[PDB]
Structure formats: structure tokens, C-alpha cells
């Protein structure tokens, strides 16, 4: 994150044989684009939703500086 090598958080995502709640077939990534659903739970990837909320957080924090307050801008 500090080094800017943000791709490292997307390397080695959860495989297609991952059993939810267990380490079998898991990965190490935390923020990924995968799209679709988990092959086992038939639901969105947890790494997809974490990345989604991080992007939403950055966007809303940026957008929260729009209106004027005690600092002239």
C-alpha cells in the first residue's frame, strides 16, 4: 500500500475449489476483481466486496470536501 504496489493485494485470489470457512483451496488476496459468484456459496466474492467498499470509501471521503467550511475553500 505504501510502496504503491497495490497489485500485490490482488495476487493469488481464492480458487474455484475453495470451501467457504475452510483453508482448502483458499488464497491470500484481499482486494480483487473477479465478478460473478463464489463457485461454492453462489454469492459475491468477499474480496470483491472489500474492494467495492474501499473504492466507495475513497470516493465518498473525496466527495465530502466539496462544501465550504471554516477554511475558506
Amino acid at each position: 500500500f505504501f510502496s504503491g504496489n497495490w497489485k500485490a493485494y490482488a495476487q493469488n485470489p481464492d480458487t474455484a475449489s475453495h470451501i467457504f470457512g475452510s483453508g482448502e483451496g483458499s488464497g491470500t488476496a484481499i482486494l480483487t476483481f473477479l465478478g460473478g459468484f463464489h463457485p461454492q456459496t453462489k454469492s459475491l466474492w468477499l474480496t470483491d466486496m472489500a474492494h467495492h467498499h474501499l473504492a466507495i470509501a475513497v470516493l465518498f471521503i473525496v466527495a465530502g470536501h466539496m462544501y465550504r467550511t471554516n477554511w475558506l475553500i
Partner: protein, 166 residues
């Protein structure tokens, strides 16, 4: 009309300031921004560049009170962000700059704070207005020279690998 550029006319916003007003603004940046904000930015750049030039030069010559400090001020950045010193300096710099927002916002709004003024004269090197103006001009000239010098130092020390001559 300008003192620095005889061809181009004198900038409209530059009439007199003890910061070294020689009327050098060919692109008219003083019309864009308030002159006070630009002066604060220039003084900040001056001080940062002077500190950085002195630190680069010294740390290449005599800087090793340990093992991780055995670098050549070109690989020093990565080594010392891994060590954790740059993190602490960044924390304190962020605190100082966050305080500086209010200082910049208290000026440009009223008050009386001159650009770049932090009331930091513990040793009282400046006594009266004449000394204050003379040393403000001296500080800004030294800071501009240090900006250019540090630019040269980094560009040369990245274009090759060497010591103080670079």
C-alpha cells in the same frame, strides 16, 4: 517596467515586498493566486530545499551512527522507509502541515500573519525591521539557490553514481 525582465511589463500584483520583489512574473501567476499564498508556498519550498540540500550533502559524507545508515542518500529513501525513520518524520511533518493549514487560513482571511512567518526566532538572530527584511531577502535567495542545487543534485546522482561532485 519590470526590474527583472526589462522587456515585459512589471507584474500588476508586485509593487513592494521585503521578500525580494524584483518583478519577476512573466506568466502572471500573481494574478491567478493571492500573492500571500504564493509567498508562503515559495518560503516553504525554500526551507525544505535548503534542509534537503544540506542533508543530502552531509549524509553522503558523514552519516553512519549505526548499520542501516550505511547508504548513499540515493538508496537511503527506500532503506529508511523500511527502517521506519521516514514514517516518524512524515508523522511530525503532517502534524506541522495540518497546523499550517489554519495558519494559511488565518491569513488570506484577516489577522496579521506575514507569509512564511511562524514566530520561530528562539536565538533572536533578527532584531529590528531592517535586519528582518535583509535576512528575509537572504533566506529567500538562499532557498531559491538551494531549490536549483537540490534539483541538480538529484538529477546528477540519478544520471550517474558518484559522490559530492555528482
Amino acid at each position: 517596467k519590470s526590474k527583472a525582465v526589462p522587456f515585459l511589463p512589471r507584474p500588476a500584483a508586485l509593487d513592494g515586498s521585503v521578500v525580494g520583489d524584483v518583478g519577476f512574473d512573466p506568466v502572471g501567476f500573481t494574478s491567478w493566486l493571492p500573492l500571500s499564498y504564493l509567498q508562503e508556498a515559495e518560503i516553504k519550498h525554500c526551507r525544505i530545499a535548503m534542509l534537503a540540500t544540506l542533508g543530502w550533502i552531509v549524509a553522503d559524507f558523514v552519516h553512519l551512527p549505526g548499520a542501516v545508515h550505511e547508504v548513499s542518500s540515493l538508496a537511503a529513501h527506500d532503506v529508511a522507509v523500511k527502517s521506519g525513520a521516514l514514517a516518524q518524520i512524515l508523522i511530525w511533518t503532517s502534524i506541522a502541515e495540518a497546523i499550517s493549514v489554519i495558519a494559511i487560513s488565518q491569513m488570506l482571511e484577516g489577522s496579521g500573519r506575514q507569509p512564511g512567518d511562524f514566530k520561530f526566532d528562539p536565538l533572536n538572530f533578527a532584531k529590528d525591521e531592517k535586519s528582518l527584511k535583509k535576512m528575509q531577502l537572504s533566506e529567500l535567495k538562499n532557498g531559491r539557490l538551494a531549490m536549483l542545487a537540490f534539483s541538480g543534485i538529484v538529477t546528477q546522482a540519478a544520471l550517474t553514481g558518484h559522490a559530492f561532485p555528482y
